[PDB]
Design a protein around this ligand. Sequence first.
Ligand SMILES: [Mg+2]
Ligand SMILES: [Mg+2]
Lengths: 188, 140, 71, 55
Amino acid sequence: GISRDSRHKRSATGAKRAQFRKKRKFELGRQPANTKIGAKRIHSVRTRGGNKKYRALRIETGNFSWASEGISKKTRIAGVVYHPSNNELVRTNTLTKAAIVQIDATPFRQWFEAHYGQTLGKKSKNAERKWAARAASAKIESSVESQFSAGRLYACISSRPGQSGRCDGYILEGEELAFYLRRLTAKK
Amino acid sequence: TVQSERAFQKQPHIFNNPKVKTSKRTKRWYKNAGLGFKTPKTAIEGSYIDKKCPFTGLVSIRGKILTGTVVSTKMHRTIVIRRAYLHYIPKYNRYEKRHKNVPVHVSPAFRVQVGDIVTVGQCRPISKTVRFNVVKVSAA
Amino acid sequence: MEDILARHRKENKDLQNKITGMKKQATKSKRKEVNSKCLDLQDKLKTKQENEIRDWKIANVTPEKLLEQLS
Amino acid sequence: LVTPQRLQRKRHQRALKVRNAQAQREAAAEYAQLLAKRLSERKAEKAEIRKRRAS
RNA sequence: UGAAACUGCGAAUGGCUCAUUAAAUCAGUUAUCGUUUAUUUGAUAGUUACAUGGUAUAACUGUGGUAAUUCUAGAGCUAAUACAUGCUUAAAAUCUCGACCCUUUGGAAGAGAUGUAUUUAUUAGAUAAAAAAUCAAUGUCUUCGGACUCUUUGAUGAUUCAUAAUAACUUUUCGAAUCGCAUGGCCUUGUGCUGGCGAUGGUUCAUUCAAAUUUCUGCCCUAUCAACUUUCG
Ligand SMILES: [Mg+2]
Ligand SMILES: [Mg+2]
């Protein structure tokens, strides 16, 4: 099908190479799975070797990591806002690697109230022993609780959906987030 | 102009912790190439991001090592070197001059100008025709 | 009002039997996937009932501010 | 059909996984003993290096 | 013993020919810290009704169709190392919570989790010659003024390597419901518990047969071919 052969191109001097052989099974290429938002729909794709490759067509959930506290929670994905390869994958709401989505901030907040104990925005004895044990770690840069006020975090996606079948990434931090929001406001 | 370009430029799988207030805002990772090649100091204190740099990125050096003389520096982060050599025709018992142009990658830790001699090492296939990588610069 | 509540109750009565049949029909391999699908269906039904109640009551942030606060 | 032979084979599978587990556990214990005595000898060599440099 | 058939395997080797192809194939020489690898060989898995679940069908019987194919329809059976389910195991350790105890310097009954594989994030993966001052935590004793009486692994020239740990993740991958030989020991005498030789199957690591790209140098004639490549890479 899609041949990723290097003899069908030109050379380094622009000469037209002739055809040399028929296209091979060890050099094939598949049609891409332009992965949308929807109910969970993953197709199995058999590879070269005795291996097997997932192909995520429509997916909605993900295991997104928080960089600072070192937690990763299974959390729904709302929609794609911004994407580096093309601007048209934003229009079709496409999850790929580094395609940036808005992720809802409910279970990170519900962990955070169980682990840090201060509400954002606006009794069992060992638990307040533990929240007395952690004092200095409760400070996060202002953009994160500004996103918690709306309950929608921005997160990048690091796991390729067309190979793994998953959609897992990391929440944007102040350097990453600051540059990406300034060019978001430059677009908006 | 480090974040001039369209996605963010970072070394992969590095972390700067916001909870711990450090003196330097960017922890940088570097490795030595081997073969007695000294890492330049601008690789360590620098702020650039490059995957194909052998001192800051995910490219090893292995195989043949070559020396040449650069002719073209006119394109983005890759330069073209030129090796002149002698080829021996056995019937006439005397040599022929010949030359081959190989386009090599260059990290921004090197200030390479045309006329200088470089030292290139083999790496993984970086592009269609680039297969090499500059690891030493000699001023001329 | 009362008709929307009766429709939501009938939808919950159908969805409970559907979730119980899906839980009973599952094997040891697919039980986690069936539980995730049932939890997603329950969350979607609760969100649909809340949106229907909000519509029945009605009928009858930006990154620039984050940039200004950061700078 | 449940025969005595299949019970014997199931018994042999259970017994083999058991004795493989104790064999690799005692191999791990003997190697832990070897690494502990090697580190003790290494600390003794460190001690004689420190007293020859102190003298 | 064994026609047929299911299942496993092979049929991707061998054999032939030289049409295309002029940095193409190839020759010598590298590389894979850039990958897949049925088989062989060696290691590898106490963590998930068990006197051993379930269902289809072929082969076969019977009825058929057409000029004709290694064509097959309907009906009636029944197997697995087919298909699909589905339990079991020892101690110990460590973390998440934690009923109560009292106000110190706090310590705890109890509950849950911790095999392997996938995916993400983070951390460890160190090695030049010696020292002192402070604050905590501890193992500590008080002449309650005081201070110490005891902790630190591999490889490569090179790595974000090998590998380990934490937080989770997953149409939950694997963790034997198989078969041939001799049938043995231990008694509370149950037809109870143990018990060998070796074929197949299986996750992963390594090896092997390989494969795939890949580095340097090399090709016959032609200027009556001097500029070629980029909308279409
Ligand atoms: Mg026989
Ligand atoms: Mg084997």
